[PDB]
Amino acid sequence: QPAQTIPWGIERVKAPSVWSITDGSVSVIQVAVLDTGVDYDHPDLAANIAWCVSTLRGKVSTKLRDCADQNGHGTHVIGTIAALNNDIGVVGVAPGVQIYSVRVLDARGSGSYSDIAIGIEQAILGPDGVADKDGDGIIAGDPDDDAAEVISMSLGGPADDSYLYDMIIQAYNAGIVIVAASGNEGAPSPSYPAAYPEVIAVGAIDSNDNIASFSNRQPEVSAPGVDILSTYPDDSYETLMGTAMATPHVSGVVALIQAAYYQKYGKILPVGTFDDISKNTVRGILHITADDLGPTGWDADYGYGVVRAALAVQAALG
Amino acid sequence: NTIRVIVSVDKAKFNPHEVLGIGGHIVYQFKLIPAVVVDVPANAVGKLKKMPWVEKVEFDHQAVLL
Ligand SMILES: [Ca+2]
Ligand SMILES: [Ca+2]
Ligand SMILES: [Ca+2]
Ligand SMILES: [Ca+2]
Ligand SMILES: [Ca+2]
Ligand SMILES: [Ca+2]
Ligand SMILES: [Ca+2]
Ligand SMILES: [Zn+2]
């Protein structure tokens, strides 16, 4: 195992200075990562893997075997959010956050919309299988429930299907922040589900603060997505690019925001909207604390700009 | 021969035992939205479409890692 390094992306989104306040280890907070599965015993990840489930072929399985990563993408994404802060490997944006690994993509890195939709339902239901156990309407942020607070989707397709959107809406109404990759075709707008209003579309920047040429345009925010070093199977590390790599940076930020807010107030922030520029919503905070690159204001390349954990947490607690 | 589709249903007219009648079977019943994933013969799409408890039938699309 190599000595721990802090990847440039984690530095860029200003995560390290937040860890004194929180590293995301607030017990009510989980981040659900709907991806190719996870190297569940990776030494730099294991302690944060709270649930390992699969929805492939429409069958919900917790067999560690069916939930393990046979591609690597999932493992990499998860490491960007939640790699442990220790003596080895790398470190995530939120190095103590609990992860739900929801395997909705197969070894090829492809997935059925149906499997993804089932995946979103599992993120809401949690291990107990019930969305709202005590029937109070509170799901995300209710300590009596085991719903995720963030749903992270480093994947996308061109179809807009009503059932998948209906599930997205269910997540949003459960108070869950949904984050998704904008896509890698250099297209004028994001793929689905990133293009839904209830989801945060994420574009990718490189280490020179330029937008990646492949990054789908008109995202909400942007984050590091070129030359991104993270965990990879088996118990190893690898460097990859994509809007799939940018997305977990954002999810990590959101995890920090909700953890820090819950630590201080015993509640989480509302999700908010694309237009929000206030301090009273996660997305509002994301937008007003982002590093505004390119032309002043929101723009087609960077969205509102590059997410900044340190500033977003300050805004949340102030 | 078989295809997987996702059917949005009218819960007032749906019972999962209705699927067998058109040659299909249920893969997954959603708990949070009124929909079911079903496997059906490919030439049975039109027939499904015309069923009273069917509000929409959608093919199962593909997403890819980014
Ligand atoms: Ca939770
Ligand atoms: Ca391993
Ligand atoms: Ca580490
Ligand atoms: Ca639950
Ligand atoms: Ca509740
Ligand atoms: Ca409650
Ligand atoms: Ca700008
Ligand atoms: Zn079947």
Swiss-Prot record, chain B:
Has a broad substrate specificity with a slight preference to large hydrophobic amino acid residues at the P1 position. Residues 1-66 form a propeptide. It comes from Thermococcus kodakarensis (strain ATCC BAA-918 / JCM 12380 / KOD1) (Pyrococcus kodakaraensis (strain KOD1)). Monomer. The chain holds residues 28 to 93 of 422 of the full protein. Transmembrane segments: none annotated. It is found in: Secreted. This is Tk-subtilisin. Disulfide bonds: none annotated. The lineage of its organism: Archaea, Methanobacteriati, Methanobacteriota, Thermococci, Thermococcales. Belongs to the peptidase S8 family.
